[PDB]
Amino acid sequence: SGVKISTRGTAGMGHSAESWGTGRAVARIPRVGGSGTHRSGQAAFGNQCRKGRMFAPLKTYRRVHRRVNVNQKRHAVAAALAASALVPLVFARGHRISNVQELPYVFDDSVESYEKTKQAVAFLKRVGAYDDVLRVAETKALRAGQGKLRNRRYKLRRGPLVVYGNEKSTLTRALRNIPGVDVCNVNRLNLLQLAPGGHVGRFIIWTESAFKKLNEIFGTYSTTGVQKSGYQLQRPLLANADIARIINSNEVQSVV
Amino acid sequence: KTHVEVSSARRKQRKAHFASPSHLRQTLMSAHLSKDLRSKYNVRSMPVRKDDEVLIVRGKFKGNKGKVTQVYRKKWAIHVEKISKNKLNGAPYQIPLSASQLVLTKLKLDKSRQSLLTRKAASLKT
Amino acid sequence: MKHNNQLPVAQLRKHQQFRIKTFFNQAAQKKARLHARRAQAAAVFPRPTEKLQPVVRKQTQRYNKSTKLGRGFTLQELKAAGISAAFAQSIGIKVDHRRKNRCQESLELNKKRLLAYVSKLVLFPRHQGKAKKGLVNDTADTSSAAQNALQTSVPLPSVSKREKAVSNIAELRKKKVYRIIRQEKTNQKWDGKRKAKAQAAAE
RNA sequence: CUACACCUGAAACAAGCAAGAUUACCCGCUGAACUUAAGCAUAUCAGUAAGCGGAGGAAAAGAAACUAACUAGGAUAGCCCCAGUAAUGGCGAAUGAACAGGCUAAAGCUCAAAGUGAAAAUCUGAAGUGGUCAACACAACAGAAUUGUAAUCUAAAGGGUCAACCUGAAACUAAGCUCCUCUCAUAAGUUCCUUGGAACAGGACGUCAAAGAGGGUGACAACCCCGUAGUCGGAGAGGAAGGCUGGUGUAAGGGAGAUUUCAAAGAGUCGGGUUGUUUGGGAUUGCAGCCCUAAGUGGGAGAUAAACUUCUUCUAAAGCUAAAUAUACACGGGAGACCGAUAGCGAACAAGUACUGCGAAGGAAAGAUGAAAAGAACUUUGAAAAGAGGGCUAAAAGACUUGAAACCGUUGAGAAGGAAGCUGUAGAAGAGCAAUAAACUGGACGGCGCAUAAGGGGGAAGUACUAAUCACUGCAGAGUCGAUACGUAAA
RNA sequence: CUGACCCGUCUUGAAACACGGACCAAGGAGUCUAUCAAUUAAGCGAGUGAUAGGGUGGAAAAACCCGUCCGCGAAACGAAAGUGAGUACAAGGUGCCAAGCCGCAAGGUAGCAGCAUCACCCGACCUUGAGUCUCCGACGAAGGGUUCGAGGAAGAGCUUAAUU
RNA sequence: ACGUGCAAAUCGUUCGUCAAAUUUGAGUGUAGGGGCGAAAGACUAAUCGAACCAUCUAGUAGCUGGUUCCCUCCGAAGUUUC
RNA sequence: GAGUAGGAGGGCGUGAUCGUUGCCUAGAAGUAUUGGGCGUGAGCCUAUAUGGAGCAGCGAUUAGUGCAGAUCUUGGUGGUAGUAGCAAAUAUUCAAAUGAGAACUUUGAAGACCGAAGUGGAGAAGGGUUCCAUGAGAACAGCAAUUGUUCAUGGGUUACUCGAUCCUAAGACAUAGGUUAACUCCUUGCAAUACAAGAAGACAUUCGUUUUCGUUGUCAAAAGGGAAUGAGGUUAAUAUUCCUCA
RNA sequence: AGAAAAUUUUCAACGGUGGAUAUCUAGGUUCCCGUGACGAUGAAGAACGCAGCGAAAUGCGAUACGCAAUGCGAAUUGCAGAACCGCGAGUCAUCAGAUCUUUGAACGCAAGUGGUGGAGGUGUAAAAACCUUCAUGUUUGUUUCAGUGUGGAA
Numbered sequence A: 001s002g003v004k005i006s007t008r009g010t011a012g013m014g015h016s017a018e019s020w021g022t023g024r025a026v027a028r029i030p031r032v033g034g035s036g037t038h039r040s041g042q043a044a045f046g047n048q049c050r051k052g053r054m055f056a057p058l059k060t061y062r063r064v065h066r067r068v069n070v071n072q073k074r075h076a077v078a079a080a081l082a083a084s085a086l087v088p089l090v091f092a093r094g095h096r097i098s099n100v101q102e103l104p105y106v107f108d109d110s111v112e113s114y115e116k117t118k119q120a121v122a123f124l125k126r127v128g129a130y131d132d133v134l135r136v137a138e139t140k141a142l143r144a145g146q147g148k149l150r151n152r153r154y155k156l157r158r159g160p161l162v163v164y165g166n167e168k169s170t171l172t173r174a175l176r177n178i179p180g181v182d183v184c185n186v187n188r189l190n191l192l193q194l195a196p197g198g199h200v201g202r203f204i205i206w207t208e209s210a211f212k213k214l215n216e217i218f219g220t221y222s223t224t225g226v227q228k229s230g231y232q233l234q235r236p237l238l239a240n241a242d243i244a245r246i247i248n249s250n251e252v253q254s255v256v
Numbered sequence B: 001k002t003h004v005e006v007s008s009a010r011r012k013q014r015k016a017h018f019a020s021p022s023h024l025r026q027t028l029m030s031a032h033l034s035k036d037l038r039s040k041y042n043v044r045s046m047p048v049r050k051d052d053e054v055l056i057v058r059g060k061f062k063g064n065k066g067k068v069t070q071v072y073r074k075k076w077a078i079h080v081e082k083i084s085k086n087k088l089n090g091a092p093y094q095i096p097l098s099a100s101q102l103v104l105t106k107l108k109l110d111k112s113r114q115s116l117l118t119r120k121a122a123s124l125k126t
Numbered sequence C: 001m002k003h004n005n006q007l008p009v010a011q012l013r014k015h016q017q018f019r020i021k022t023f024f025n026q027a028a029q030k031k032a033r034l035h036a037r038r039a040q041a042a043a044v045f046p047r048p049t050e051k052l053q054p055v056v057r058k059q060t061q062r063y064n065k066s067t068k069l070g071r072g073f074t075l076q077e078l079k080a081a082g083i084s085a086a087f088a089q090s091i092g093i094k095v096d097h098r099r100k101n102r103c104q105e106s107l108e109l110n111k112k113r114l115l116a117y118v119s120k121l122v123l124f125p126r127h128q129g130k131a132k133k134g135l136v137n138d139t140a141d142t143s144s145a146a147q148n149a150l151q152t153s154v155p156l157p158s159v160s161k162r163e164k165a166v167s168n169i170a171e172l173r174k175k176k177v178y179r180i181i182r183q184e185k186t187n188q189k190w191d192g193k194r195k196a197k198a199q200a201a202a203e
Numbered sequence D: 001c002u003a004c005a006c007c008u009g010a011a012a013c014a015a016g017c018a019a020g021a022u023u024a025c026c027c028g029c030u031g032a033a034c035u036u037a038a039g040c041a042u043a044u045c046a047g048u049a050a051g052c053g054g055a056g057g058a059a060a061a062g063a064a065a066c067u068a069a070c071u072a073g074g075a076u077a078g079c080c081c082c083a084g085u086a087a088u089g090g091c092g093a094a095u096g097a098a099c100a101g102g103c104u105a106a107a108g109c110u111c112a113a114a115g116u117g118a119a120a121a122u123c124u125g126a127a128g129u130g131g132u133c134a135a136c137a138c139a140a141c142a143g144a145a146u147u148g149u150a151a152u153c154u155a156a157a158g159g160g161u162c163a164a165c166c167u168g169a170a171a172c173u174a175a176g177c178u179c180c181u182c183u184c185a186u187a188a189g190u191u192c193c194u195u196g197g198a199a200c201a202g203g204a205c206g207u208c209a210a211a212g213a214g215g216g217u218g219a220c221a222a223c224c225c226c227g228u229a230g231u232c233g234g235a236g237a238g239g240a241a242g243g244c245u246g247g248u249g250u251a252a253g254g255g256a257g258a259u260u261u262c263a264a265a266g267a268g269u270c271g272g273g274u275u276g277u278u279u280g281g282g283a284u285u286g287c288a289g290c291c292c293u294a295a296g297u298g299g300g301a302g303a304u305a306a307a308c309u310u311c312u313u314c315u316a317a318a319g320c321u322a323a324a325u326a327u328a329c330a331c332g333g334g335a336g337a338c339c340g341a342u343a344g345c346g347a348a349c350a351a352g353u354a355c356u357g358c359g360a361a362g363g364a365a366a367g368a369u370g371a372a373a374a375g376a377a378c379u380u381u382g383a384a385a386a387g388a389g390g391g392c393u394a395a396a397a398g399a400c401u402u403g404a405a406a407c408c409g410u411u412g413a414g415a416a417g418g419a420a421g422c423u424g425u426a427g428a429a430g431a432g433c434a435a436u437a438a439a440c441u442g443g444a445c446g447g448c449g450c451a452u453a454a455g456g457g458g459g460a461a462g463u464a465c466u467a468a469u470c471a472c473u474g475c476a477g478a479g480u481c482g483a484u485a486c487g488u489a490a491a
Numbered sequence E: 001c002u003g004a005c006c007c008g009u010c011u012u013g014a015a016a017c018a019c020g021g022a023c024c025a026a027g028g029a030g031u032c033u034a035u036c037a038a039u040u041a042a043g044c045g046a047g048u049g050a051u052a053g054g055g056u057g058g059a060a061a062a063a064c065c066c067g068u069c070c071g072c073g074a075a076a077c078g079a080a081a082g083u084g085a086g087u088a089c090a091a092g093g094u095g096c097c098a099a100g101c102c103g104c105a106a107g108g109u110a111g112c113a114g115c116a117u118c119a120c121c122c123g124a125c126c127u128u129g130a131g132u133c134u135c136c137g138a139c140g141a142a143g144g145g146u147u148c149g150a151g152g153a154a155g156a157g158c159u160u161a162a163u164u
Numbered sequence F: 001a002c003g004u005g006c007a008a009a010u011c012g013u014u015c016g017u018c019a020a021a022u023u024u025g026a027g028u029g030u031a032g033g034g035g036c037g038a039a040a041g042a043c044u045a046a047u048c049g050a051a052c053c054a055u056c057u058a059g060u061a062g063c064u065g066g067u068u069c070c071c072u073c074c075g076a077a078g079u080u081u082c
Numbered sequence G: 001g002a003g004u005a006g007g008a009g010g011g012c013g014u015g016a017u018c019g020u021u022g023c024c025u026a027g028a029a030g031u032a033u034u035g036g037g038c039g040u041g042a043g044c045c046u047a048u049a050u051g052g053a054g055c056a057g058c059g060a061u062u063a064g065u066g067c068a069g070a071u072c073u074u075g076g077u078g079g080u081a082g083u084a085g086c087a088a089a090u091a092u093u094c095a096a097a098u099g100a101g102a103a104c105u106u107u108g109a110a111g112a113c114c115g116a117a118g119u120g121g122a123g124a125a126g127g128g129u130u131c132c133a134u135g136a137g138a139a140c141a142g143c144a145a146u147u148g149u150u151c152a153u154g155g156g157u158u159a160c161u162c163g164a165u166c167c168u169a170a171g172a173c174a175u176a177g178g179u180u181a182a183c184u185c186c187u188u189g190c191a192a193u194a195c196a197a198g199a200a201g202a203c204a205u206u207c208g209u210u211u212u213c214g215u216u217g218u219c220a221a222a223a224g225g226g227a228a229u230g231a232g233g234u235u236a237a238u239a240u241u242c243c244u245c246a
Numbered sequence H: 001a002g003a004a005a006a007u008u009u010u011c012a013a014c015g016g017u018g019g020a021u022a023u024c025u026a027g028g029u030u031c032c033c034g035u036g037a038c039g040a041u042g043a044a045g046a047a048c049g050c051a052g053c054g055a056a057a058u059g060c061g062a063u064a065c066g067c068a069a070u071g072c073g074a075a076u077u078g079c080a081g082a083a084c085c086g087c088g089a090g091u092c093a094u095c096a097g098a099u100c101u102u103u104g105a106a107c108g109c110a111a112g113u114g115g116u117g118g119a120g121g122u123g124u125a126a127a128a129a130c131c132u133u134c135a136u137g138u139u140u141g142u143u144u145c146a147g148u149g150u151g152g153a154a
Ligand SMILES: [Mg+2]
Pocket: A025
């Protein structure tokens, strides 16, 4: 976005406007010479003046977009997935996982061929997912202020994200109109869907093809990734993340 | 939504609505058909006409039934017989109504109508 | 102008306001290119996307070690292939008339390329008639309906594995490389004065 | 001398062409100062503004008189690099490209010049005839033209001699597709309660969803209405400055390869000198005047001036050419971490308007009653404005949403002998639906209503251990995938 | 009752007989782009990172994969012609000095990083040279400097964001 | 006199000249480093020792003025050299 | 435990974006408070009143993010103050009438002024409906108004003889020719820096035919030149114009 | 305790001035994509007109807020009068046929003027009045011509 630049100039600059000069017991600011209009003698272009150009007229070429190193995009997506696997975290995100069973939640490709919405619903209901979906439905906000006039009418919290592995699957058309559902093809995943708001951990429902390709795509501390073609997952800083174990063991306390 | 050429802007649409030329307006202000008629023509909604019989579904005037006196498209109003209020000087005046709060009990029938209805039913059931 | 930092290099000295370039079209542009390419395929359907390209060495001393896609085939090469420029063109081959072959091997690569091309070729004449030059292939090939990419069908491999030999070590060890390069550089250096001496002692 | 022919000029008439407009992008010219060098002439700003002449949907550019010297590359244009490099500069300030290499895009063609001379084979108009009748095909007659039209040809060749092998205007005749424009149609609650003037709110029961984008309906409505989705779907009408592809196939038209006493190519132009100007181009960056003024293995170029020897590369002085590229302009589309009536274009509005200036030119202010005018009936006092009654309405919200401050009036509680206000400390008066307060925890016992206790068995789930099993680590047979400067000329 | 000059500003000096301010609302001033550097968090490490562009993809300009070159580092010294971290088995010495190991303690052992110094090395500038050959110009056993360098001597970089 | 006028040059008295180098209407010739001037740097539309309009133009300012919320902590220089 | 210039560390408050937790026709935002409290402080929470549709917290992302000043911008308001002031151009007065109201309107009766270099009768420039009639709330006519150059509604500008139109002037511009990158510019009545440029007649009556004589344009004057009209009468408003007569 | 008022002054409530704040938006602004498509067949612009009741803005041109065709298929609406139920409403849309005054590159000449030439048509006894037509450059031609330009038969 930017402020009008045209033949005439940056907006607010559109007068032939002078500085009256010190003699008049008036401020030195530029005015509009002319006759016959109430605008006459009125202060001319400058921040101070009603009807004048900004402090830093804002430009088009302000560089908004940033570029991330691939390795860090990946490391990010990874740590995101890692997060998605622990109950404390996805619960900590506010998702409703109570009636959900085992995380990762994985299912059969029977799902991938779903067409109508009703069955995607019934599906969520069976799996116990539906609680979370219910929440997206019961908190639906009118956006606070300006946003509405800006073409974003409603604030909706995020629901369950499903990851399917079959390029041609209908789960897409199926889940579509359900508020809060999120569909992704395993081969290409977004930190953005993975960690909405930069907030780690989320409810995911996986396919078989999905879940299996996961490894081929990424790899493991024995092997590199295929799809990422040489990506090695992060090398942990501490094998064991319980400092409990480590402060509290024999070796420690004997010496302590 | 599926199509990039579909304007989602408040502005554009509101504009379309209020800037609606007469013929399009008639469409825009339209009523919902009675269970009976729904079933008869296999059509949910119909644009209103000045000879139709309707039932006010919502308003202080809900529940009343009658003929449509005036479709005043400019004022956005539908008038229904005996839907008027009386003034202290003894002067009667009509009370305007929004179509989408009405229900069509009996249509004004004639060839063009029947053709329209026919097309709607056509895409519907088929 | 204050501290130890490196002397600035002016940028905005002129009026650049008129001279700025913006990259938002890029987004859509990429896309457009895609569809263009695709719509080419569809309109070209039986035929390949990119026309036949010979290969050459790059133009700089540093680039010589590498391989590069040429713009066209050398008339000399079309000759050894047995194609007329015109025909090769009706085939989808790319010809370049200003390029010249100064090496046997450069003939070879492109011959191999051409032949490879022809062998893998299918030619549709006016329906059910057959023809001679570069010839014309059977009506059943019409059913064969090949959509193919040129890199798959007519490619160029090289691997660096350098074979080893001992007898030669025994050999190579008897000369002195440095001394060599030196006396050579030297020879190039003084050649002129030396020839001039020959000429002068001759007259 | 006449008739007549031809060269040259002139008038009227027939049929066609140009004249202005457009501004963003494009072309050819013309061309400064402010500014920076902390002064200032060179320089910089800068080939920039202003000015002029031309276009187009793009323009321009383009098939080498290019690079490079390497095992070379090969039209033009844009992206990335090279690069802030080589160079230019009171070598100060500061200027400043390109080759190679990675991409996008791809395309190549027409003339002059020995050759019809077995014959102007050519071009234009045309009363007319057929036609899809403005656009097509023939056409009696007329002009143009040997101070030369058409076929061969354009250096990558080519002429001449062979020649494998190829092609098809005419006419006749079948079936089709592409693109554009204007129209027509499509799910599912108006069920029930409560608060509302209004239900689009909070509850209860329901539905559709490849439709829960977004709007409108008296309120934050998927299901009331327009829409959204299935829909690069279906149906109807009309289009192409008169879109595109077949099958026979005529007179006729090509040519790989082969050989051959053959083999011809742009002049006051290229080049030079000088003077300006321009470029990084620096003793030959481009261009322009003036003065010289060519050649024909000649002529260009090979980033230092001039010879001399050798090598390399291209053919100038005539033309056409899609794409990738640029668009603050116009009409359209869609969108946005824009703005939100002193903001945002100057203009949300009878805005380039009112108004001013002889004129060139200047140029504002100004958006929201209500769901519906239901816009205040009628009584009374007034000359009239208007007041008091009375009424609409959810409410006067009444020229209108909210309705802050400054300023002003009224009512209340205070205070003051040449100003006021204010830190610290107490007091008095005035205004008050009161924000603090002797409550709270337990033992034993009583009166009430509800539940079922501890302890004991019991022991689902949990944790811990632990053999048998089994994720993971380790070892690791057979199949399939991959890699490999191990190996081979490759395999 | 005690204490109490008008604020903002420039100034050595403001209550000043220095300047702006009668009052109120709304508006109103270190931004944006580029450049190098230092620091902080990130990733990878003798490497690092793409851009352009390709290929996929949500309704969508996102994302996700590819991306033979290129940047910057990895070698320096010279105007340049040019040379290149010279005994293959090297990668040092010394003074300060941390861990680990001894020891109740005193101290002993060891010697990472850094600082100072001496030594070696490549190149600039000097100086010297048996012998060798494609012998007229190059090569090199041995031997050196009062000097010069944004250098060697077991590589520390590259990309991202932020601040100054 | 008025001098926040009746007036961005007026008003009262007074005064120069009053058949010429007189006064005056319209039309027409001269335009900006240019006109035009019995010459005062006068006049050129209240603008003149270089008109007026728009643009380059937010022209540059070693100089004047302003520079917008809280607390806590450390805390200067008016000397050196060019 | 001081502190200007200055620097650092924490925090308060404001939009918008991705998240997360919620509030609102059972009343959001905003607004007023001599209601009750919380922070050392930026600021906060609550209560009551008003208001009548949207809001808020928490983690991040981003910024046109905080005003007492700049003779700061635009808008709105004070004190001065019912003050300075409404005093040039000799003057008004009485009765009646009209009206809610009369020093300021209309008639009459008196007294004065401009004193034919006018305060008279008509034009040019300039104005453009300001003219005529009827009516009239506000505003304006710096007191007033029953009145108007103001507001509303209707109606008014007649020509052979007046003027424009024609003519020529100071002048000016085409055409032709030449100059310019181009735009532009230079010449032209004594007419050309041009030049194969015209007019008339007749028959014909088109052409054509024919004859005659011939170098070639236009604009600029409502006081200059300039074919011919007068008197009387008429309208609310036109008249050397209409009517009548000559 | 000149212990009342008036004045000067603090605070609140209500009223008056005033239009801040909050919430909106048929507006702006920027980005991406699609087409470039004016004119002597008279453009861009200008003047004056055109509604039953109309000034402006917008539309239109003596066929004058509009004709025709086509698609929507019943309104316009501030008042009044008609027209229309399909012989079809409409301030609707679409738009491919018409109307298109005086002008303007602007065109017979001229112009602060509806002035004024030539040719043709009309009108008349003849006039007046009305109407149509005529700009410049250029490429071809057609017709008529000039040249002590070059040739040149009978
Ligand atoms: Mg002053």
